[PDB]
Amino acid sequence: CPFHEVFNATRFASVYAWNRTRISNCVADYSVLYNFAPFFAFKCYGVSPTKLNDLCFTNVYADSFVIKGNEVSQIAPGQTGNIADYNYKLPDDFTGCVIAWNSNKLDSKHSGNYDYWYRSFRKSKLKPFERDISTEIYQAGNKPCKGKGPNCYFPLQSYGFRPTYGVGHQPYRVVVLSFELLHA
Amino acid sequence: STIEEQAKTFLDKFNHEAEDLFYQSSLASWNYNTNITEENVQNMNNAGDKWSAFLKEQSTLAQMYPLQEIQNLTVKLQLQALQQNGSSVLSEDKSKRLNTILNTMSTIYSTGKVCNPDNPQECLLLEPGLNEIMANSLDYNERLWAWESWRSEVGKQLRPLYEEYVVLKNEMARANHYEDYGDYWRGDYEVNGVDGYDYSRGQLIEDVEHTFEEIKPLYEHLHAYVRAKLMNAYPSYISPIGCLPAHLLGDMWGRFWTNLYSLTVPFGQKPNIDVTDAMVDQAWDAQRIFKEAEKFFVSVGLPNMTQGFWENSMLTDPGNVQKAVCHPTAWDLGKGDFRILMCTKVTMDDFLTAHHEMGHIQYDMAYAAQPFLLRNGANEGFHEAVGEIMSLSAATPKHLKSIGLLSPDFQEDNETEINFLLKQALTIVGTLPFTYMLEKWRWMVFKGEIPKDQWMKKWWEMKREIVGVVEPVPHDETYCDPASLFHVSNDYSFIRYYTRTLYQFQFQEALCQAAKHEGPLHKCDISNSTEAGQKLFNMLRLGKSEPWTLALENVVGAKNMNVRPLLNYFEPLFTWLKDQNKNSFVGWSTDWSPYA
Ligand SMILES: *[C@@H]1O[C@H](CO)[C@@H](O[C@@H]2O[C@H](CO)[C@@H](O[C@@H]3O[C@H](CO)[C@@H](O)[C@H](O)[C@@H]3O)[C@H](O)[C@H]2NC(C)=O)[C@H](O)[C@H]1NC(C)=O
Ligand SMILES: *[C@@H]1O[C@H](CO)[C@@H](O[C@@H]2O[C@H](CO)[C@@H](O[C@@H]3O[C@H](CO)[C@@H](O)[C@H](O)[C@@H]3O)[C@H](O)[C@H]2NC(C)=O)[C@H](O)[C@H]1NC(C)=O
Ligand SMILES: *[C@@H]1O[C@H](CO)[C@@H](O[C@@H]2O[C@H](CO)[C@@H](O)[C@H](O)[C@H]2NC(C)=O)[C@H](O)[C@H]1NC(C)=O
Ligand SMILES: *[C@@H]1O[C@H](CO)[C@@H](O[C@@H]2O[C@H](CO)[C@@H](O)[C@H](O)[C@H]2NC(C)=O)[C@H](O)[C@H]1NC(C)=O
Ligand SMILES: *[C@@H]1O[C@H](CO)[C@@H](O[C@@H]2O[C@H](CO)[C@@H](O)[C@H](O)[C@H]2NC(C)=O)[C@H](O)[C@H]1NC(C)=O
Ligand SMILES: *[C@@H]1O[C@H](CO)[C@@H](O)[C@H](O)[C@H]1NC(C)=O
Ligand SMILES: *[C@@H]1O[C@H](CO)[C@@H](O)[C@H](O)[C@H]1NC(C)=O
Ligand SMILES: *[C@@H]1O[C@H](CO)[C@@H](O)[C@H](O)[C@H]1NC(C)=O
Ligand SMILES: [Zn+2]
């Protein structure tokens, strides 16, 4: 089953322009990831991970995230925050497994890997499994909005990955395998 | 479309920009401090220019929101910090003159040297030089010669510049809608807002006066003992009942009295505690010292050190290959980067400095969750105090005896305790009057109560009334004595030290009492106590998010400065001083002057 292209890729995407990779037509036997990648985090909120080999899946989607350290705990059902409210929202009956791992050796530069952006501002809320790519200038007042400068802001802000940051600022790659058993 | 939301969004943008900018500035400063190179200086200058320009630009955008419409008590402090005109109140020529005079004063103080008379080829700088003469010489005439000289060439050449410095500083202070520049410094302790926890700017002066009015008898007894002891070294140069001349105190200005330990030791037969030999016999390096400090800190429930801390921080001087400035420092670069910079050799003093700096690092690590503008101490005194409480706790004989660095049969007697108390006293208690006097003089000058032609007439009387020191030679209006100090030539406050000294003993007493200690305070160890660790942590992790009164109440239990622990820590020393000087003269009089 195709996971080498996903879980051993070249490059991933920013949080606001997340992929929805489609995986289909195979038998879920992910023991290879246990040896290839020593997963520090592994949370399955549905059925037991050991019993996951009992049933196969058809319409599972996966996502490509590069987020901070003290941010992965926000990727959980019923949580709140900037990322949960503005980039990626999970359902209450979320049936899948979240997997993350450190990626310092391939996602950092001395000057800075300024290639990952994240949404910070919005005059609205999000809905589960929504993707937005809007780059329109954001209004903060009553006055008409014309470019950046005064209160109008560009609703995209970048990260600052450097090799000598602490654990809470180094990137963890999160691939949310939300395989719903009833729809698969 | 309300205003508080717009202010909040501006704060959100500022927090994200400032983090990266400040990280770059700190990293450049660290790299420059480790090495020495001209292009590194250029890079540091460029980074500082970028940081300053970013701060100045971001200040302008914050002026749109008036402060009076805010009901949050949390964003208010951030906006108040950001909304302050840094140096934009003045005109361009005013700023040019101010920067010119400040740099001129700094350079003049930096490059001061003195030449011995009739020897044009023999000149000495201030440091090294006059410091060695003051600190390790028993001669008499040379000390007087240097004391007269340095002041004579420095004060007369720096007074006129200081006049314009004072004038411009007062002009700026009045421009920023304050009373005077002394009010500008007093404003750091100001907390206004929440009911029950108000602290006006004018209350600090009265608090300082009332608190100092209590330790004066102990200082009197200690000063009488010192004067009695000095009769053996200067038989024919000390007045029997007068004040101690300032030229025989072991320092250029008289800040500390530490250099008198070997001359006023109570029982000199038994030497003090020094654990060097056991340190050498086990082949100790910096790694063992730092891991022992880590073990001590984790013993009370505090977290450990970060994994990167053991890797990115240098512990010993590399040698001749590189060239750094050896001065202990704990660096808070942000974003989970904490490092310690110190040139280490196996000695007890460095073993204590390690604890001091690691406590500093733990305090930095405590408040990492607060916003950027709130990541500092409650005021300008908590930081070194939290540093020093650990040092006081870790150097007691009981702690050294327990950890296996001393003989398991080591009999502690009641004979070394007097020596230890006197050694601590000569460096802690003997400095408070000096700080109090200097701050009083500076505030009186800024307010203006002392006319320009009557400065010395009050300056030398304050010395006699507070520190008990009398000038050895007559002086005229040409001299400018106070400007010779490091913190006077440079723009720096001085009231931090009094607050630190008062706070540290209060913290120590609270932790010892909550730690189930038996006996006098001087034999206390804060080890093995989660009770004293949780209490401290409830203050460590607040940061600047709460008024300092509430932060103090979570540890001490009282919301005001207290002086009882400072007198409690010296109960047996006070008893011995009372016993010893029953047959001597008490107090000092302004009657004897060496020149008359
Ligand atoms: C002053 O303004 C700040 C900023 O708006 C207020 O901070 C907010 O305080 C509330 C709690 O009173 C926080 O709520 C909680 O947030 C967590 C997620 O972080 C959520 O899981 C909880 O269910 C709850 O909603 C809120 O996050 C926090 N906001 C920020 C941006 O820090 C503060 O409360 C205001 N102070 C007063 C006295 O009203
Ligand atoms: C913070 O410091 C403490 C104290 O140094 C660290 O404690 C460490 O805990 C582990 C787990 O108990 C110790 O390892 C071994 O545990 C087994 C039992 O599972 C025991 O049989 C072994 O004899 C051994 O104790 C470890 O030695 C101990 N100390 C050290 C030096 O690591 C803790 O891990 C540190 N953690 C953090 C967050 O920094
Ligand atoms: C993930 O993909 C990389 C890139 O193809 C693999 O890297 C190669 O690993 C082999 C191991 O023997 C080396 O001989 C090659 O030189 C590596 N790359 C190159 C340049 O071809 C990596 O092994 C893959 N691993 C996983 C987890 O599937
Ligand atoms: C320094 O801060 C004061 C705040 O009082 C600024 O004062 C303003 O002065 C201008 C010109 O007199 C008035 O239009 C504004 O309404 C004042 N603002 C307030 C809030 O009183 C002053 O401009 C600042 N100086 C600078 C930034 O150079
Ligand atoms: C204070 O801390 C020391 C830290 O070592 C404690 O020492 C240990 O105490 C237990 C008590 O049963 C002994 O078995 C260990 O051998 C001790 N370790 C040593 C001496 O290194 C000490 O007990 C603590 N204080 C009190 C009163 O409990
Ligand atoms: C994500 O989608 C983009 C679409 O252009 C594609 O280029 C990229 O390779 C995809 N990668 C992943 C991680 O699925
Ligand atoms: C400091 O200088 C030495 C030699 O000049 C060099 O090897 C080292 O890399 C420098 N330090 C840094 C952080 O670049
Ligand atoms: C120790 O205690 C004894 C008790 O009689 C006392 O005489 C002595 O002076 C004390 N101090 C010293 C320094 O021995
Ligand atoms: Zn310190």
CSV table of N, CA, C and O in Angstrom, one decimal, chain A residues 105-154:
chain,number,residue,atom,x,y,z
A,105,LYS,N,16.5,18.0,11.0
A,105,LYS,CA,17.7,17.8,10.1
A,105,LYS,C,17.3,18.1,8.6
A,105,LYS,O,18.2,18.1,7.8
A,106,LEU,N,16.1,18.3,8.3
A,106,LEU,CA,15.7,18.5,6.9
A,106,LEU,C,14.7,19.7,6.7
A,106,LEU,O,14.2,19.9,5.6
A,107,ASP,N,14.4,20.5,7.8
A,107,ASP,CA,13.5,21.6,7.7
A,107,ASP,C,14.0,22.9,8.3
A,107,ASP,O,13.2,23.7,8.7
A,108,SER,N,15.3,23.0,8.4
A,108,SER,CA,15.9,24.2,9.1
A,108,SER,C,17.1,24.7,8.2
A,108,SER,O,17.7,24.0,7.5
A,109,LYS,N,17.3,26.0,8.4
A,109,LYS,CA,18.5,26.7,7.8
A,109,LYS,C,19.1,27.7,8.7
A,109,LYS,O,18.4,28.1,9.6
A,110,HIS,N,20.3,28.0,8.5
A,110,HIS,CA,21.0,29.0,9.4
A,110,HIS,C,20.3,30.4,9.2
A,110,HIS,O,20.1,31.0,10.2
A,111,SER,N,20.1,30.8,8.0
A,111,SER,CA,19.4,32.0,7.8
A,111,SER,C,17.9,31.9,8.2
A,111,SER,O,17.3,32.9,8.6
A,112,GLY,N,17.3,30.7,7.9
A,112,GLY,CA,15.9,30.5,8.3
A,112,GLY,C,15.1,29.9,7.2
A,112,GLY,O,15.1,30.4,6.0
A,113,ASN,N,14.4,28.8,7.5
A,113,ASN,CA,13.6,28.1,6.5
A,113,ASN,C,12.2,28.9,6.4
A,113,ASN,O,11.2,28.5,6.9
A,114,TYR,N,12.3,30.1,5.8
A,114,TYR,CA,11.1,30.9,5.7
A,114,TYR,C,10.2,30.5,4.6
A,114,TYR,O,9.8,31.3,3.7
A,115,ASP,N,9.8,29.2,4.6
A,115,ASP,CA,9.0,28.7,3.6
A,115,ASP,C,7.7,28.1,4.1
A,115,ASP,O,6.9,27.5,3.3
A,116,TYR,N,7.4,28.3,5.4
A,116,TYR,CA,6.2,27.8,6.0
A,116,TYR,C,5.4,29.0,6.6
A,116,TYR,O,6.0,29.8,7.3
A,117,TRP,N,4.1,29.1,6.2
A,117,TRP,CA,3.3,30.2,6.6
A,117,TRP,C,2.1,29.7,7.4
A,117,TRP,O,1.8,28.5,7.3
A,118,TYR,N,1.5,30.6,8.2
A,118,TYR,CA,0.3,30.1,8.9
A,118,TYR,C,-0.7,31.3,9.1
A,118,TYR,O,-0.2,32.4,9.3
A,119,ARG,N,-1.9,31.0,9.1
A,119,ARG,CA,-3.0,32.0,9.3
A,119,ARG,C,-3.0,32.5,10.7
A,119,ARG,O,-2.9,31.7,11.7
A,120,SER,N,-3.2,33.8,10.9
A,120,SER,CA,-3.2,34.4,12.2
A,120,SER,C,-4.5,35.2,12.5
A,120,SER,O,-4.9,35.2,13.6
A,121,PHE,N,-5.0,35.8,11.4
A,121,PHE,CA,-6.2,36.7,11.6
A,121,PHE,C,-7.3,36.3,10.7
A,121,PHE,O,-7.1,35.8,9.6
A,122,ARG,N,-8.5,36.5,11.2
A,122,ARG,CA,-9.8,36.2,10.5
A,122,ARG,C,-11.0,36.8,11.3
A,122,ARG,O,-11.0,36.7,12.5
A,123,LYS,N,-11.9,37.4,10.5
A,123,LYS,CA,-13.1,37.9,11.1
A,123,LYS,C,-14.2,36.9,10.9
A,123,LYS,O,-15.4,37.2,10.5
A,124,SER,N,-14.0,35.7,11.3
A,124,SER,CA,-14.9,34.6,11.2
A,124,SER,C,-14.3,33.3,11.8
A,124,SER,O,-13.2,33.3,12.3
A,125,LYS,N,-15.1,32.3,11.9
A,125,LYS,CA,-14.7,31.0,12.4
A,125,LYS,C,-14.7,30.0,11.2
A,125,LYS,O,-15.2,30.2,10.1
A,126,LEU,N,-14.0,28.8,11.5
A,126,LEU,CA,-13.9,27.7,10.5
A,126,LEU,C,-14.9,26.6,10.9
A,126,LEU,O,-15.5,26.6,12.0
A,127,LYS,N,-15.1,25.7,10.0
A,127,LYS,CA,-15.9,24.5,10.0
A,127,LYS,C,-15.1,23.3,9.8
A,127,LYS,O,-14.0,23.4,9.1
A,128,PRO,N,-15.5,22.1,10.3
A,128,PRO,CA,-14.6,21.0,10.2
A,128,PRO,C,-14.3,20.6,8.7
A,128,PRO,O,-15.1,20.7,7.8
A,129,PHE,N,-13.0,20.2,8.5
A,129,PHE,CA,-12.5,19.9,7.2
A,129,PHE,C,-12.8,21.0,6.1
A,129,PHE,O,-13.5,20.8,5.2
A,130,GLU,N,-12.2,22.1,6.4
A,130,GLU,CA,-12.3,23.3,5.5
A,130,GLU,C,-10.9,23.7,5.1
A,130,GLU,O,-10.0,23.7,6.0
A,131,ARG,N,-10.7,24.1,3.9
A,131,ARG,CA,-9.4,24.6,3.4
A,131,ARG,C,-9.7,26.0,2.7
A,131,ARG,O,-10.6,26.1,1.9
A,132,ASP,N,-8.9,27.0,3.2
A,132,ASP,CA,-9.0,28.3,2.6
A,132,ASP,C,-7.6,28.8,2.1
A,132,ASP,O,-6.6,28.6,2.8
A,133,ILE,N,-7.6,29.3,0.9
A,133,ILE,CA,-6.4,29.9,0.3
A,133,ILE,C,-6.5,31.4,0.0
A,133,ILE,O,-5.6,31.9,-0.6
A,134,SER,N,-7.5,32.0,0.6
A,134,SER,CA,-7.7,33.4,0.3
A,134,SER,C,-6.5,34.3,0.7
A,134,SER,O,-6.0,34.1,1.8
A,135,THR,N,-6.1,35.2,-0.1
A,135,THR,CA,-5.0,36.1,0.2
A,135,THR,C,-5.5,37.5,0.2
A,135,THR,O,-4.7,38.4,0.1
A,136,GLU,N,-6.8,37.8,0.2
A,136,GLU,CA,-7.3,39.1,0.2
A,136,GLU,C,-6.9,39.8,1.5
A,136,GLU,O,-6.9,39.2,2.6
A,137,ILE,N,-6.6,41.1,1.4
A,137,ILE,CA,-6.2,41.9,2.5
A,137,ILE,C,-7.4,42.0,3.6
A,137,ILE,O,-8.5,42.0,3.3
A,138,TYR,N,-6.9,41.9,4.9
A,138,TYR,CA,-7.9,41.8,6.0
A,138,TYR,C,-8.2,43.1,6.6
A,138,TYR,O,-7.3,43.9,6.8
A,139,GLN,N,-9.5,43.4,6.8
A,139,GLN,CA,-10.0,44.6,7.3
A,139,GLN,C,-10.1,44.5,8.9
A,139,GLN,O,-10.4,43.5,9.4
A,140,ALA,N,-9.7,45.6,9.5
A,140,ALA,CA,-9.8,45.7,11.0
A,140,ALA,C,-10.8,46.9,11.4
A,140,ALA,O,-11.2,46.8,12.6
A,141,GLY,N,-11.0,47.9,10.6
A,141,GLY,CA,-11.9,49.0,11.0
A,141,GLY,C,-13.1,49.2,10.0
A,141,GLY,O,-13.4,48.3,9.2
A,142,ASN,N,-13.7,50.3,10.2
A,142,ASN,CA,-14.8,50.7,9.3
A,142,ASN,C,-14.4,51.2,8.0
A,142,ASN,O,-15.1,51.0,7.0
A,143,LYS,N,-13.2,51.8,7.9
A,143,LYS,CA,-12.8,52.5,6.7
A,143,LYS,C,-12.5,51.5,5.6
A,143,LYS,O,-12.3,50.3,5.8
A,144,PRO,N,-12.6,51.9,4.3
A,144,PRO,CA,-12.3,51.1,3.2
A,144,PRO,C,-10.8,50.6,3.3
A,144,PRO,O,-9.9,51.4,3.7
A,145,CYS,N,-10.6,49.4,2.8
A,145,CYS,CA,-9.3,48.7,3.0
A,145,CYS,C,-8.5,48.8,1.6
A,145,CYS,O,-9.0,48.3,0.6
A,146,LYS,N,-7.3,49.3,1.7
A,146,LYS,CA,-6.5,49.5,0.5
A,146,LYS,C,-5.0,49.0,0.8
A,146,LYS,O,-4.2,49.8,1.3
A,147,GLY,N,-4.7,47.7,0.5
A,147,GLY,CA,-3.4,47.2,0.7
A,147,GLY,C,-3.0,47.1,2.1
A,147,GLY,O,-3.8,47.3,3.1
A,148,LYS,N,-1.7,46.7,2.3
A,148,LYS,CA,-1.1,46.7,3.6
A,148,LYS,C,-0.8,48.1,4.0
A,148,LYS,O,-1.0,49.1,3.3
A,149,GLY,N,-0.1,48.3,5.2
A,149,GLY,CA,0.2,49.6,5.7
A,149,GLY,C,-0.5,49.8,7.0
A,149,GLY,O,-0.2,49.3,8.1
A,150,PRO,N,-1.6,50.7,7.0
A,150,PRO,CA,-2.4,50.9,8.2
A,150,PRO,C,-3.2,49.6,8.5
A,150,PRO,O,-3.0,48.6,7.9
A,151,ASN,N,-4.2,49.7,9.5
A,151,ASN,CA,-4.8,48.6,10.2
A,151,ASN,C,-5.0,47.4,9.3
A,151,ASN,O,-5.1,46.2,9.8
A,152,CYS,N,-5.2,47.5,8.0
A,152,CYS,CA,-5.4,46.4,7.1
A,152,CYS,C,-4.1,45.5,7.2
A,152,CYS,O,-3.0,46.0,7.1
A,153,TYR,N,-4.3,44.2,7.3
A,153,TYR,CA,-3.2,43.3,7.4
A,153,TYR,C,-3.3,42.2,6.4
A,153,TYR,O,-4.4,41.8,6.0
A,154,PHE,N,-2.2,41.7,6.0
A,154,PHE,CA,-2.1,40.5,5.2
A,154,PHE,C,-2.3,39.2,6.1
A,154,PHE,O,-1.5,39.1,7.0
